[PDB]
């Protein structure tokens, strides 16, 4: 016997009702009519909420609908005019499917628990922005939202996207709707370094946003705008700035495609449903039933999981909230004050249309985004060199072995040349300097460098009570803020690591020993293990190696022998071996190997132990380091470092002597 299973809907016009019934009949024809049949019922939108709710309880539910479809009316009244149905069906847990409601407030299962849609909300548009942000590599942006469930939801979604990454709240800006003048808030926005902006608001609000933004000239180049579908449309389009980036959902305007597809999905869901037993028909009529419909949540469960990827609208799958997944948007550009498709977005991946990119103001291509850095260093020969500027004149045109002129920068640092020690203006040129300027071209920052007063990089010291003072040296300057960032050859260790953030290593090296070749088995050398007053092994007190000796318990005995006859600086330490004052010298390879090449009278031996890396210091609180590492890696992949080590490590004359 056939069984007539009703469906119900509220649609804009009788023609669309006919479209609905037609799609339903297509569903009946193409699936078993012997077992089950589908029947269609629908009604036009009513002027108030109440006539319509009454229509659902009377005109629809009296027909025992298993589900309801809803569309936005011809003239939108306020917003979320399909609010009542979600509540009304919701009492009985009758599933509701909206065609045209992109509104975000329906995403919370709590308030509307029966609500599903064939379109993603405005909040989900953020999926694009993250992907957009992903491609262009701007991690720094600004978000401008209206204050309501819509804007706050958008913020939550985008931030949630960012949560997988280090959470990025570069800045967030909330304004309340209906406010004609927003100027002050944007004045606050300019102060924020990040130059890319994204906003969500209503059309009327957006007019005010662009109106206020143009006054402060934030529509100009070096600034980027990302926006919602609503923002580009309407009166907002009229006052919209040039070069803006914009979004439009596909088939958002059409109810009918979504009708055919939604009903198709409903049919698949039902036919999949009746495979299950212990089913109950929905309540007949509103009157006399105070009870929910036990099947309804199940119908929702299958319907959310209902696949059928082939559809007139595109791929169909439903997120947890019942919102649609994998929807497609078409990116839009404002070129010549007109809307154009620069690209189109479908699935999880953006697609680039052949059209040329536009940015605000004049750009053929301009992806630009995102004020001082005090930098500190130490005098370490391979990665840093010190010469004073000749008189007032600045720096020598001296050239690298590969023909290039040597770059150089000014640095204020300790001078031992005068009997008293003045902080002296000096010229410094280095591997780390070339790296720093490489970053400076890559990074928005500008740099001024002065060498730390203390020759030591840093070590914890001084007074007993509480914890008193702080580690002496450039590191101490970093915490103190004397320099906000540290560029030098610094080994990276946990004891320091808790105090500060560390950039990904530019270099990888480990400690080793220098001894003259011309006539040390291991890091563990019996000769070290068999110390002798006669055979010296020398180091610098307060050098990080000393921290290795003090912190480590296992070798703690061995530290003391090294402690004897310590040298103050690197040059003196190399010299002692060269002078033959000291038979052996212990230091990390990166500083040592270059010297090993430099003389060849002296040699490095054994295997780098205490294997470590050199990195640029920053406070954990400063986010610029996030880019720095991100940049460091980018510098590693291209072989930039390899060529820089190749330049600054000469390798000219030396060999394995034996």
């Amino acid at each position: 016997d056939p069984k007539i299973v009703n469906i119900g809907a509220v649609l804009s016009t009788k023609k669309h009702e006919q479209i609905f019934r037609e799609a339903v009949n297509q569903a009946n024809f193409f699936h078993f009519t012997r077992k089950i049949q589908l029947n269609a019922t629908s009604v036009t939108h009513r002027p108030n909420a109440i006539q319509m709710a009454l229509s659902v309880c009377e005109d629809l539910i009296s027909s025992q609908v298993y589900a309801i479809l809803v569309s936005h009316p011809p003239a939108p009244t306020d917003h979320l005019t399909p609010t009542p149905i979600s509540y009304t069906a919701g009492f009985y847990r009758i599933p509701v499917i909206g065609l045209t409601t992109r509104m975000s407030i329906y995403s919370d299962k709590s308030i509307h628990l029966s609500f599903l849609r064939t379109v993603p909300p405005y909040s989900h548009q953020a999926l694009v922005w993250f992907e957009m942000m992903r491609l262009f590599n701007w991690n720094h942006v600004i978000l401008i939202v209206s204050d309501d469930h819509e804007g706050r939801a958008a913020q939550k979604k985008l931030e949630t996207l960012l949560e997988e990454k280090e959470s990025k709240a570069d800045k967030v800006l909330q304004f309340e709707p209906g406010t004609k003048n927003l100027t002050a808030l944007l004045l606050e926005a300019k102060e924020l370094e990040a130059r890319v902006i994204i906003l969500s608001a209503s059309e009327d609000d957006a007019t005010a946003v662009y109106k206020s933004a143009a006054m402060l000239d934030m529509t100009g180049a070096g600034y980027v705008w990302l926006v919602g579908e609503r923002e580009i449309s309407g009166s907002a389009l009229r006052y919209a700035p040039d070069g803006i980036i914009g979004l439009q959902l596909i088939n958002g305007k059409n109810e009918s495609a979504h009708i055919s597809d939604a009903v198709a999905v409903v049919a698949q869901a039902i036919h999949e449903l009746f495979e299950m037993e212990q089913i109950t028909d929905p309540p007949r009529g509103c009157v006399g039933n105070t009870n929910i419909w036990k099947t309804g949540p199940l119908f929702k469960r299958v319907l959310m999981s209902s696949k059928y990827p082939d559809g007139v609208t595109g791929r169909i799958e439903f997120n947890e909230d019942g919102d649609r997944k994998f929807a497609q948007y078409s990116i839009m550009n404002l070129q010549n004050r007109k809307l154009v498709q620069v690209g189109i977005f479908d699935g999880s991946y953006i697609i680039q249309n052949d059209r040329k990119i536009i940015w605000p103001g004049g750009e053929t291509e301009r992806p630009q985004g995102y004020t001082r850095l005090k930098i500190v260093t130490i005098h370490q020969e391979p990665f840093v060199y010190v010469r004073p500027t000749t008189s007032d004149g600045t720096c020598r045109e001296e050239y690298t072995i590969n023909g290039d002129p040597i770059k150089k920068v000014i640095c204020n640092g300790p001078d031992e040349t005068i009997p008293g020690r003045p902080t002296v203006p000096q010229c410094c040129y280095g591997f780390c300097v070339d790296l720093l300027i490489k970053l400076a071209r890559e990074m928005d920052f500008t740099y001024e460098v002065h060498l730390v007063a203390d020759g030591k990089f840093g070590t914890q010291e001084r007074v007993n009570n509480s914890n008193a003072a702080a580690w002496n040296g450039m590191m101490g300057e970093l915490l103190s803020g004397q320099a906000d960032m540290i560029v030098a050859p610094l080994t990276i260790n946990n004891e320091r690591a808790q105090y500060i953030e560390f950039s990904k290593p530019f270099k990888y090296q480990g400690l080793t020993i220098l001894v003259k070749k011309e006539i040390i088995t291991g890091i563990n050398d019996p000769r070290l293990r068999n110390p002798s007053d006669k055979f010296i092994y020398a180091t610098v007190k307060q050098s990080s190696v000393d921290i290795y000796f003090r912190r480590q318990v296992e070798l703690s005995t061995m530290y003391r022998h090294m402690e004897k006859h310590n040298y103050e600086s690197a040059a003196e330490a190399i010299q002692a071996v060269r002078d033959n004052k000291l038979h052996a010298f212990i230091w990390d390879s990166a500083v040592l190997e270059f010297e090993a090449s430099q003389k060849c009278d002296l040699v490095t031996t054994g295997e780098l132990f205490f294997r470590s890396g050199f990195g640029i210091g920053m406070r954990k609180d400063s986010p610029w380091k996030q880019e720095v590492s991100l940049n460091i890696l980018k510098s590693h992949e291209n072989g930039f470092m390899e060529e820089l080590d190749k330049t600054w490590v000469r390798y000219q004359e030396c060999d394995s002597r034996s």
Partner: protein, 633 residues
């Protein structure tokens, strides 16, 4: 001149057809400037259509300026419905009993709706006072997606943070009643929580399902206790015994004041708000009531009424509301389910302060407690599985039983002995079994595998074996200090980058390791090319890997250093040796799993180095670890 207001009130239920009509409205406090004009109507059972139709029907031309709703029903939904009408009408509506009094989603600010039920926040506060009174410090929350969640979670969070006491929030659970479950997903979560005192939040109907499921889970019994808000208890007239006994919840009392007295309170609030609004603007509140047409003009002006109506006082009694529309502090009663079906009062609570009646006891090793099941895997020499003598029927000597789901297998070896000494010293007893999925823990995409899985699933407290140590596992689970010197190493017959590329050497070179190992994962992390190349040289098992080395067809083998050293010592011929001094990179030791920061923890660690502290480990090394080879020394 004469300002007579227009008002309507409805009662549903009352357990009567011919429900008591117009019992009240009788002139009281007539002095108030506006006199009430009342029309009373009753309807038997609730519906969205019936209620909407009737309320609009009473609206007609009648032009009522206020409505009070009351019900015999337990239904949650009703309040929201009437609230919706309010949003549409801008005509004030409130309710004195049952569902309308039951909590609802946060009210639209423009909308005017009020409830004589307590605030969600207030209720949470009372629940906290109750727990504090019995000094039940440690508790968890089970909630559902119903509205007020997270207003509740937040309120509990705020109330809890301030207090000095070291209370513990154990778990918070959010489960959608929608997408109703075949999975018993609620059973699967609820089964997890170990906490003694549970706060539940949901619709009246939902509580039943959650409770049947709890009854299956075993959560209703013996020492655990449940505490509930207004909604579940509702009217309290009807109580499915699916609810467990000893269930504790707060509700408004019928006895103190009967429903007509409450209705009198509502009428008094409406007419007092009218009188105050009058005093302020000398203006009639009366407005056209008809919903069907557009809302009457100057009704938009009505907002101030809400502003006036929030706090109202008569009869020396405060009706003051909160921004949400719940009354600020209605009197409340602490109620319990007495044995059988009784709802019998336990406490009274008002304003700031709470008072409760019962004194005490409302409704096994001294040093330490519980039991620990342990999982392991077989590896030689350390953990050896042997088949027990069938004639004996049970394990012999040092062998300790271990079961593998697929049969009793007999485990003995290094892990068995170390574990045995540790158990002897810390004095606890334990159950030992064998792992099935993935042996030592293995990661495919997002998820962990192996003994670590049983450590995470809490199917195992501690995992023992030849398991190596790494940063990830130390991150997820606390590890014991290393008992033995071990690590990655090489075993061959007899950093250079010879390993880095085979292709540099014209003949093809060969080296491989066992997959799903800490070694292979470490390799993939640091050295990619080696992994991608060595996947071809990967071997099924250590005996088989040994087959690849021993019979030829493979040059070098790489594996754990302890195993490679013991194998160095033990070989059918001294055909195999270690690399260099066998000094291993990635210097590590065998650790032991624990759950997290909460564990016997340090107590274990001490025990371990006591083992070496008495020198037992050297003996055990000579017996188990020492091989005969490395004989020419």
């Amino acid at each position: 001149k004469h300002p007579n207001m227009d008002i309507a009130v409805i009662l549903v239920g009352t357990t009567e057809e011919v429900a008591i009509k117009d019992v009240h409205e009788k002139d009281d406090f007539h002095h108030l400037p506006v006199t009430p004009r009342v029309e009373l109507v009753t309807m038997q059972e609730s519906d969205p259509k019936s209620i909407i139709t009737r309320i609009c029907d009473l609206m007609s031309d009648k032009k009522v300026q206020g409505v009070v709703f009351g019900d015999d029903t337990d239904q949650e939904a009703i309040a929201q419905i009437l609230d919706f009408i309010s949003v549409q009408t801008l005509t004030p509506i409130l309710g004195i009993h049952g569902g309308s009094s039951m909590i609802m989603a946060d009210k639209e600010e423009a909308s005017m709706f009020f409830q004589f039920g307590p605030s969600i926040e207030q209720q949470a506060s009372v629940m906290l006072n109750i727990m504090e009174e019995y000094d039940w410090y440690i508790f968890s929350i089970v909630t559902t997606y119903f509205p007020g969640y997270q207003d509740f979670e937040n309120k509990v969070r705020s109330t809890i943070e301030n207090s000095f006491v070291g209370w513990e929030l154990e778990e918070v659970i959010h489960l959608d009643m929608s997408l109703d479950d075949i999975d018993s997903k609620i059973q699967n979560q609820l089964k997890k929580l170990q906490s003694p005192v549970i706060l539940l939040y949901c619709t009246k109907e939902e509580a039943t399902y959650i409770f049947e499921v709890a009854h299956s889970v075993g959560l209703t019994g013996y020492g655990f206790t449940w505490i509930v808000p207004s909604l579940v208890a509702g009217d309290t007239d009807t109580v499915p015994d699916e609810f467990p006994t000893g269930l504790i919840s707060v509700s408004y009392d019928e006895w103190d004041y009967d429903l007509p007295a409450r209705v009198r309170d509502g009428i008094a609030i409406i007419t007092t708000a009218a009188s105050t609004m009058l005093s302020e603007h000398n203006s009639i509140p009366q407005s056209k009531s008809s919903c069907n047409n557009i809302q009457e003009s100057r009704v938009y002006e009505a907002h101030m009424l809400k502003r006036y109506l929030i706090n109202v006082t008569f009869e020396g009694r405060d009706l003051s509301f909160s921004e949400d529309g719940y009354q600020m502090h209605p009197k409340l009663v602490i109620i319990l389910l007495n044995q059988e079906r009784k709802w019998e009062r336990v406490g009274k609570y008002k304003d700031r302060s709470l008072k409760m009646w019962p004194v005490f006891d409302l409704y096994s090793e001294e040093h330490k407690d519980e039991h620990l099941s342990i999982v392991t895997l077989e590896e030689a020499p350390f953990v050896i599985v042997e088949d027990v003598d069938p004639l004996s029927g049970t394990c012999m000597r040092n062998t300790v039983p271990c079961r593998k789901q697929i049969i009793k297998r007999c485990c003995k070896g290094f892990c068995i002995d170390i574990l045995k000494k540790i158990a002897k010293t810390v004095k606890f007893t334990y159950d030992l079994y064998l792992v099935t999925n993935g042996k030592h823990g293995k990661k495919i995409n997002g998820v962990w595998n192996g003994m670590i899985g049983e450590v995470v699933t809490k199917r195992a407290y501690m995992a023992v074996g030849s398991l190596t140590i790494n940063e990830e596992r130390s991150e997820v689970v606390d590890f014991s200090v290393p008992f033995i010197e071990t690590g990655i190493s090489v075993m061959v017959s007899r950093s250079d980058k010879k390993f880095q590329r085979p292709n540099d050497f014209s003949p093809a070179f060969r080296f491989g390791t066992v997959p799903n190992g800490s070694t292979e994962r470490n390799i993939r992390n640091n050295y990619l090319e080696m992994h991608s190349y060595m996947v071809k040289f990967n071997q099924r098992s250590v005996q088989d890997a040994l087959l690849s080395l021993k019979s030829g067809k493979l040059d070098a083998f790489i594996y754990d250093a302890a195993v490679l050293n013991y194998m160095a010592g033990r070989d059918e011929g001294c055909k195999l040796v270690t690399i260099g001094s066998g000094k291993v990179f990635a210097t590590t030791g065998y650790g032991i799993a624990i759950q997290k920061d909460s564990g016997w923890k340090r107590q274990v660690d001490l025990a371990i180095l006591q083992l070496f502290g008495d020198g037992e480990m050297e003996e055990l090394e000579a017996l188990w670890l020492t091989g005969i080879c490395h004989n020419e020394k």
